[PDB]
Design a binder for this molecule. Structure first.
Ligand SMILES: *[C@@H]1O[C@@H](CO)[C@@H](O)[C@H](O)[C@H]1NC(C)=O
Ligand SMILES: [Zn+2]
Length: 1016
């Protein structure tokens, strides 16, 4: 019995949308605690029978790339921190240290001699060094897809289980720029019991602190019962550095950062330095410090207090270890021996803190509030909202989603077989997982690293894409060649991948042309892969060297095809126009591929001397004044010309779209007899403030509402075909394309902001929809959350991450925009949606990056636009914090994130070729996905194991019967199953041994993991 995620509004103590609606967000000077108030406490609260227990938790925040690359920081800082931690913890048995970033720890450990590896294991086993979270990185929470948050968590935790024999159950997220409930969702299903967060809006910290609601049971927005709840501690102050972690007054706390006395090149901004603790000052110093602790303790419900002790790349120098430890040891000895304080203070770990808090809870000392919602958009001070990084470095944001899919496909394709070690499959997959995992760092995908660090991430992701291609193409060859003929060279390229949308037309010529000719090669095999667990049709396209090409399946059945020219757009520096040129020797062929669930389908492209019976040719119309000719070689239809004009197009029995004379959508008509609904695309620009704070990689500080881009008289190209039609327009900084294939349109923007300094380009949709102040945005590609535009907050606070889509609706109509890349967006007026495309900023925004964003490069952004009637849909009530996609919008999102993969056979003849793989795979209900399929064992293992992550979304019921489907039992996808277990999502703990070796499907909004074991 599944929980209903639509109809029951959860009763929680704190619901963030409701809290936002009531809160005033005034930025008043609260005294030494600038964004709070002067905290008072009753000295009589703690006594002999009830002491304040204080855990001082040493830590070192190590960014895997930011101002330096991963490898530069490793060489210059992290290897020294870890080596000195090993020495100092070994030598000082009461000292403690927590570590978060497993990418660095693995880089260090694998360079240690055996003697030191053993010492390291002993300080972990004895509890002195404790891993927190245990992910490869500490991920961004705004732009990251949940599948990649899980990937990186699994990469780090798998490493820790194998080498350190530990699995963290407490998470530490001190630096991502705002926080998502996707984290507790994944963590709770991965064995965690507690989590800590820090970067939340200063007004939220004040509000929750006043009510002692900084520790809470964080449940999902739709969860009525509470089974998703994860205990969460929110830190109360402005930073995680020592000045902001001992108590409310940084001028005092800074005196207890013993690295700031001078010799380390650090000082206290508040102008009172630390002083070495001695017998003649320890009483006074302890009085000051305990007073700060007791104030901090007033904000929480138990008598157990967490005091983090650390900062960025701390605990490097031996002298720094000594100066912090010895001074703190003298404070503890004095405080703990002086009964009047009623304090017991010690170095601790994060787990120790949480264990003690829950001991207090069980003693009945405290009850904790329940909370749902998210913690975007973050502001650390004043109006400085961190919504810029929702868009910064959008080329790499898009590359993240391409690689996400490539990793899933490579792991799935190669999972079907066991591979000899010589094939290097595990090596290539581990490289690809680790590079993608690294980029989930909160300075990777966020676009907040220095230029040369961004280059490092890009090069690492390119290597990862090449690794995935290699694994995928070896796997396709194996899966589709008769076994007694299969003769692999594991270094050879049997297929190359063809990707139409990455890096994308005008980003890179990387697309191979299939070269056919009477005197060279009559035909070519191509293969499509479908990673989704249902039968899928999708139009696919290839470049070919003749327009006279026909398509057949591998029963030699003709397949209907359409040939179109290859159009590229050029900024003509001579005519000062942006206009398309057609190839006279290469052509695009398009046809519908039909591919089994988690399967492969082979087709053949064959040249002929003349127009093939089953291939049609698109017409082309170039709208511009002063046209010049556009020859297209042997292409059978001549290009037509016209002055700019409004136009209408309809493909299949799909919607009719109307366009303005500037080539931009103006209306959509869903059916023949239905109305033309206004839906108007517009491009605008935001600028930067000439006074006060400047936008940069993190902050979005616009100088007012956006202004329309001046379009001039742009060139519009219309291609009209039986299978696919398009309207493309060359605008300043954007080649904008609307593509129609018979359902919701696809939008592609080739965005090149060029040298336009201090500019952010936004794409806006204007409609009639009576949405008011409500809109919906997704969180990590997992869930859609209700947003409310608040006029009490500035424009940039009303921007939210759009990691995979957004929608507005009224009683009757919804408009959903799905994205193939995370970007920032909002609805700034009723009936509007907007999403930022790129931003180029000359200034640093004072958050430590030390540069602007001036390294833009052309990026192809992709979208689907779904207009729907929703008056018949069963939707949540007005007080529910969630929203849900329709079937068509979810499928559209899947078309963007997990398209069919296209392979071109590399050599002239494929001996032993087969037509299909996976025809007998179950075609699962449309809301179910196999998010992960990964073989967990190498070929020498007697018992093979394959792990699956299933996810079931929740789609709106809108009266479509859409019925008969097959049960998917992932445990029987591979033969000879001997056991099926439900596991944590990382595959690291068995939770249930499943009857009959059958893996049940999951409920709406649930995710489960299963491991099947196979005798081999
Ligand atoms: C892994 O940790 C413990 C189980 O949680 C021990 O019981 C087990 O022996 C250990 N493995 C070792 C120490 O190699
Ligand atoms: Zn950081």
């Amino acid at each position: 019995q599944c929980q209903d995620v639509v109809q029951d509004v959860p009763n929680v103590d704190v619901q963030m949308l409701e809290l936002y609606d009531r809160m005033s967000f005034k930025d008043i000077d609260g005294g030494v605690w600038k964004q709070g108030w002067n905290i008072k406490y009753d000295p009589l609260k703690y006594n002999a029978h009830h002491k304040l227990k204080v855990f001082v938790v040493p830590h070192s925040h190590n960014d895997p790339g930011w101002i330096q690359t991963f490898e530069e920081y490793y060489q210059h800082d992290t290897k020294h921190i870890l080596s000195n931690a090993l020495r100092h913890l070994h030598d000082n048995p009461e000292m403690k240290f927590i570590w978060a970033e497993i990418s660095y720890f693995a880089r260090f450990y694998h360079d240690l001699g055996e003697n030191k590896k053993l010492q390291m294991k002993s300080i972990v086993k004895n509890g002195q060094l404790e891993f927190v979270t245990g992910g490869w990185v500490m991920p961004d929470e705004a732009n990251s897809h949940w599948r990649n948050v899980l990937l990186q968590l699994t990469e780090g935790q798998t490493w820790l289980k194998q080498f350190m024999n530990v699995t963290p159950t407490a998470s530490w997220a001190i630096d991502p720029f705002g926080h998502s409930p996707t984290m507790p969702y994944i963590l709770q299903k991965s064995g965690f019991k507690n989590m800590l967060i820090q970067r939340t809006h200063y007004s939220v910290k004040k509000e929750l602190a006043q009510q002692r609601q900084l520790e809470f049971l964080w449940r999902q927005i739709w969860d009525n019962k509470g089974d998703t709840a994860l205990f969460t501690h929110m830190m109360p102050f402005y930073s995680y550095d020592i000045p902001h972690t001992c108590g409310p007054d940084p001028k005092v706390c800074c005196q207890f950062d013993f690295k700031r006395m001078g010799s380390f090149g650090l000082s206290c901004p508040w102008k009172v330095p630390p002083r070495t603790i001695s017998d003649q000052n320890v009483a006074a110093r302890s009085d000051l410090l305990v007073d700060q602790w007791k104030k901090k303790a007033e904000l929480y419900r138990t008598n157990v207090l967490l005091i983090p002790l650390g900062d960025d790349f701390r605990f490097k120098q031996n002298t720094e270890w000594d100066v912090q430890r010895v001074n703190y040891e003298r404070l503890f000895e004095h405080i703990n021996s002086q009964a009047h304080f009623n304090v017991q203070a010690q170095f601790g770990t994060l787990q120790e803190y949480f264990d003690a808090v829950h001991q207090a809870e069980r003693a009945g000392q405290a009850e904790f509030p329940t909370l749902s919602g998210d913690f975007f958009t973050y502001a650390d001070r004043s109006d400085n909202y961190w919504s810029g990084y929702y868009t910064s470095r959008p080329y790499h944001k898009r590359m993240d989603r391409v690689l996400m899919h490539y990793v899933r496909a490579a792991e799935m394709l190669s999972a079907w077989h066991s591979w000899d070690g010589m094939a290097r499959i595990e090596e290539r997959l581990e490289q690809a997982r680790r590079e993608l995992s690294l980029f989930q760092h909160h300075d990777g995908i966020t676009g907040t690293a220095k230029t040369h660090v961004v280059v490092d991430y890009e090069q690492r992701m390119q290597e990862a894409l090449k690794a995935c291609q290699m694994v995928m193409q070896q796997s396709v060859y194996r899966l589709l060649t008769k076994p007694s003929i299969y003769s692999p060279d594991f270094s050879f390229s049997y297929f190359t991948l063809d990707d139409s949308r990455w890096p994308g037309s005008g980003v890179e010529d990387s697309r191979t042309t299939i070269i056919l000719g009477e005197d060279i090669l009559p035909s070519k095999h191509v293969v499509m892969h479908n990673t989704l667990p249902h039968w899928r049709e999708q139009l696919v396209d290839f470049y070919v060297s003749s327009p006279f090409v026909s398509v057949t399946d591998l029963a030699n059945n003709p397949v209907e095809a359409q040939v179109s020219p290859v159009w590229s757009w050029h900024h003509d520096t001579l005519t000062k126009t942006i206009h398309p040129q057609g190839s006279t020797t290469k052509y695009r062929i398009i046809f519908k591929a039909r591919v089994p669930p988690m399967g492969l389908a082979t087709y053949v492209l064959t040249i002929s001397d003349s127009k093939p019976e089953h291939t049609s040719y698109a017409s082309n119309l170039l709208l511009r004044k002063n046209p010049t000719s556009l020859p297209l070689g042997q292409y059978p239809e001549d290009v037509k010309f016209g002055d700019p004009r409004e136009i209408s197009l309809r493909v299949g029995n799909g919607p009719t779209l109307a366009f303005s004379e500037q080539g931009l959508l103006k209306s959509i008509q869903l059916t023949q007899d239905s109305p033309h609904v206004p839906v108007h695309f517009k491009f605008l620009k935001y600028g930067v403030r000439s006074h006060g704070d400047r936008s940069g990689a993190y902050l979005f500080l616009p100088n007012g509402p956006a202004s329309p881009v001046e379009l001039g008289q742009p060139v519009v190209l219309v291609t009209k075909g039986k299978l696919e039609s398009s309207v493309s327009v060359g605008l300043p900084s954007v080649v904008h394309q609307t593509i129609m294939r018979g359902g919701a349109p696809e939008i592609r923007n080739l965005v090149d902001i060029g040298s336009l300094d201090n500019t952010e380009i936004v794409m806006r949709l204007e409609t009639h929809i009576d949405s008011g102040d409500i809109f919906y945005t997704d969180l990590n590609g997992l869930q859609f959350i209700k947003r409310r535009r608040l006029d009490k907050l500035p424009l940039q606070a009303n921007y939210y991450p759009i990691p995979s889509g957004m929608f507005i609706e009224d009683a009757n109509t919804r408009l959903t925009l799905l994205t193939g890349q995370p970007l920032g967006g909002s609805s700034l007026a009723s009936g509007e949606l907007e999403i930022m495309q790129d931003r180029r900023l000359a200034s640093d925004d004072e958050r430590g990056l030390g540069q602007g964003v001036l390294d833009n490069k052309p990026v192809l952004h992709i979208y689907r636009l779904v207009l729907e009637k929703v008056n018949n849909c069963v939707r949540p009530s007005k007080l529910h914090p969630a929203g849900y996609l329709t079937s068509a919008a979810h499928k559209a999102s899947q078309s963007l994130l997990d398209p069919l993969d296209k392979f071109i056979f590399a050599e002239n003849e494929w001996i032993g070729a087969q037509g299909q793989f996976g025809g007998d795979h179950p075609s699962a209900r449309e809301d179910l996905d196999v998010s992960v399929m990964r073989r967990l064992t190498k070929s020498s293992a007697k018992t093979q194991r394959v792990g699956y992550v299933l996810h079931r979304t929740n789609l709106m019921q809108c009266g479509t019967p859409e019925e008969h489907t097959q049960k998917l039992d992932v445990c029987h996808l591979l033969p000879n199953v001997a056991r099926c277990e439900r596991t944590t999502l990382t595959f690291l703990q068995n939770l249930e041994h499943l009857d009959g070796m059958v893996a049940p499907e999951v409920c709406p909004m649930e995710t489960a993991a299963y491991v099947s074991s196979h005798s081999s």
